[PDB]
């Protein structure tokens, strides 16, 4: 007869009903990512709005229960994910403009048609094209055209098209009683109402700024080593005292530095650890990749995979008669169904994501008992972090020693793991300022800190101060340089990739201290030790019912987001990076310009 009991019977209706109409939507989307068919693409759009026009009728009915008197915290964190009005706060003609402009920025990014005026007889597609030219092209001007033209034909038509986007997404947030749209991406880290574990949105900017200040000498010594190892490749293109140019970081924008490993290898005479030539000689197939990915998971204490997982999933690319888009996504269809979908091959970087992708499922199999609106991660960067630690322990030479891949007589000297830790430095450490700067730019264009005529001057100045990158061409305000990405154009939160790193090594500091590991962190293996599974399953089963700052205290013993376990993972690297950097100059200056001709 009170508002607490009124919200319990409404959410009990809702969960059950939602489960029916979430499966029906997700199964039609699973049949679209297996059978790309014109007959099946309308079944996804017919099952898609039936969950979209269901959540619109359920959010209006969830707005009649005020949160001012609901005292049980499980009900309040359920209604907080439902009473959010979403993008329906605007008027009629203003909000349909938001929907039709997301379809003209998502279609213009995937289908960007750019090529060279010198030879326009045959042109380009992004894949297999401009991502390949950032891998095995070691020329300066040939990569200059490959990077400037993507910011002169794709970013050109987004610069007067995203000025309307920032003034329209502020209206999506200032009607939801926020400060800007930047507080909406920071709104998932909000914890309020629990004693001692509060977390405001404005404290997240002060928390990333204190964690980035401690990885500042670690990223700088990579920057003094990548620059010193790129001097021989380009003799008169990179200054020794200045910053790095943008179009030689090995990626399409400069996020990941994985493709820069073959030029800046520390010890090329010793072979890198690979088991690709070991898996094909042992007649390993697509099933045994996920068979031994499961033997890591039942050997930590985590539950066995369901019987419906091995029959309804898709592991091999089913011929050239039907297209299956198999970029690896782990599918929670709901209702006890946990399938997986990737065209797995017999390579090591395919085998390593098999442990990462089942970590998405073993997280999602754990909060199956939770209600439906809390069946998610603790935050939006929490799900990708609990999967990568499972891949981080499957890449050690001690784990591949167990499953028969590596040699029985395998040597391992002090110059071997430095080549492995630089492989992890160019994918995890080098993306840490590139995730922070892009999100600091987004938070400082949503707050109105810089106007139209200053919209890009505080981007490259945010580049050659934070990430140490100078753009090679003097850009005007007619280009929108961050608009050329997968995560900016498609309207996704990007701070989840910063917080994924600081959780994926903080969890490994806690699991290896529970698994009794005597050594550094990069040789730790959480398998065959069930003391670390129970310290993980006390977090995995919570979901969103418990706040994220208590999901961290349940694992690591610290309520906040720390940074010292990440620097402790790279402790044999940080010592070695100081050993070789005596002849170079640490740091950089904001003076160097490649266009200072």
């Amino acid at each position: 007869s009170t508002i607490e009991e009124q919200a319990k019977t409404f959410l009990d209706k809702f969960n059950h009903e939602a489960e029916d109409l979430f499966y029906q939507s997700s199964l039609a989307s699973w049949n679209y990512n297996t059978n790309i068919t014109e007959e099946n693409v309308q079944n996804m759009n017919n099952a898609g709005d039936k969950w979209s026009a269901f959540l619109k009728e359920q959010s209006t009915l969830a707005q009649m229960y005020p949160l001012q008197e609901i005292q049980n915290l499980t009900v309040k964190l359920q209604l907080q994910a439902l009473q959010q009005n979403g993008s329906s706060v605007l008027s009629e003609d203003k909000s349909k403009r938001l929907n039709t402009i997301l379809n003209t920025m998502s279609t213009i990014y995937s289908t960007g048609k750019v090529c060279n005026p010198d030879n326009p007889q045959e042109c380009l597609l992004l894949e297999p094209g401009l991502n390949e030219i950032m891998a095995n092209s070691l020329d300066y001007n040939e990569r200059l055209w490959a990077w400037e033209s993507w910011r002169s034909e794709v970013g050109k038509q987004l610069r007067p098209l995203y000025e309307e986007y920032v003034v329209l997404k502020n209206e999506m947030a200032r009607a939801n009683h926020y400060e800007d749209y930047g507080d909406y991406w920071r709104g998932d880290y909000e914890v309020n109402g629990v004693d001692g574990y509060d977390y405001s949105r404005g404290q997240l900017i002060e928390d990333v700024e204190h964690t980035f200040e401690e990885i500042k000498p670690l990223y700088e010594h990579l920057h003094a080593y990548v620059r010193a190892k790129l001097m021989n490749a380009y003799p008169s293109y990179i200054s020794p005292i200045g910053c790095l140019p943008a179009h030689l970081l090995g990626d399409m924008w400069g996020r990941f530095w994985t493709n820069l490993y073959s030029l800046t290898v520390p010890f090329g005479q010793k072979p890198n650890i690979d088991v690709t030539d070991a898996m094909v000689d042992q007649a390993w197939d697509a099933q045994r990749i996920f068979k031994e990915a499961e033997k890591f998971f039942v050997s930590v204490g985590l539950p066995n995979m369901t019987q419906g997982f091995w029959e309804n999933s898709m592991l091999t690319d089913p011929g050239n008669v039907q297209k299956a888009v198999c970029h690896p996504t782990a599918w929670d269809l709901g209702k006890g169904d946990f399938r997986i979908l990737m065209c797995t091959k017999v390579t090591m970087d395919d085998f390593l994501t098999a442990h990462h992708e089942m970590g998405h499922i073993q997280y999602d199999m754990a909060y199956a008992a939770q209600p439906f609106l809390l069946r998610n991660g603790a935050n939006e960067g929490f799900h990708e972090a609990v999967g990568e630690i499972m891949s981080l322990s499957a890449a050690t030479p001690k784990h591949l020693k167990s499953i028969g891949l590596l040699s029985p007589d395998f040597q391992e000297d002090n110059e071997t793991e430095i080549n492995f830790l630089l492989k992890q430095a160019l994918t995890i450490v080098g993306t840490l300022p590139f995730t922070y700067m892009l999100e600091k730019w987004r938070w400082m264009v949503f707050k109105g800190e810089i106007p139209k005529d200053q919209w890009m001057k505080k981007w490259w100045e945010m580049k050659r101060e934070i990430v140490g990158v100078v753009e090679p061409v003097p850009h005007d305000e007619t280009y929108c340089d961050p608009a050329s990405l997968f995560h900016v154009s498609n309207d996704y939160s990007f701070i989840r990739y910063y917080t994924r790193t600081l959780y994926q090594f903080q969890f490994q500091e806690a699991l290896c201290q529970a698994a009794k590991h005597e050594g550094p962190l990069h040789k730790c293996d959480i398998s065959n030790s069930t003391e670390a599974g129970q310290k993980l399953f006390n977090m995995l089963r919570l979901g969103k019912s418990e706040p994220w700052t208590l999901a961290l205290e349940n694992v690591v013993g610290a309520k906040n987001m720390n940074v010292r376990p990440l620097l402790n993972y790279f402790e044999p690297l940080f010592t070695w990076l100081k050993d070789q950097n005596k002849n170079s100059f640490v740091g950089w200056s904001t003076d160097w310009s490649p266009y200072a001709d």
Binding site: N312, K335, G336
Partner: protein, 194 residues
Amino acid sequence: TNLCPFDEVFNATRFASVYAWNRKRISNCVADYSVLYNLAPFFTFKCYGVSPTKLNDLCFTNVYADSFVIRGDEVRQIAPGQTGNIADYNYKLPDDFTGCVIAWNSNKLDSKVSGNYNYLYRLFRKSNLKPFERDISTEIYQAGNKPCNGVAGFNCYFPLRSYSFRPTYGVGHQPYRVVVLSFELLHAPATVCG
């Protein structure tokens, strides 16, 4: 020796929903519970007060075979002293229950591809159920301080919600045909043994 009709509460075509569980009064015959358990075509079988090694020795007067169909994680609720969703609004066993449930997974003959909305289960009720009680009613559950006159609009919700049964779910949510066997004694002469 005439066998009791256990061929009509186990190998039946369709079972009833858990809000309308049909009670079959099996009497005036000779049982053979042993057959079921022993050939183990069926699975879980748990009793209290009686046991299958003592089943065919002592006999009763009227065995109550109550058949229904529930989900996977709801078989645990059909047990004495259990609280939850099925055990409080659909089917409650008393504290001195003297029979055993028999639950076998039925994903082959009971679940249809793309929806089986033919089975209902009660989600809301004004009070808990007395033991061995069935409520076949569709009156709209008042959860507010506003008397609704039959329309299920705001805070006046429909009581029976539909099981969805896709083949692909999980042991977690596959259909589980459950039949209990409530044994009891009266002043009437006991019939069902041999």
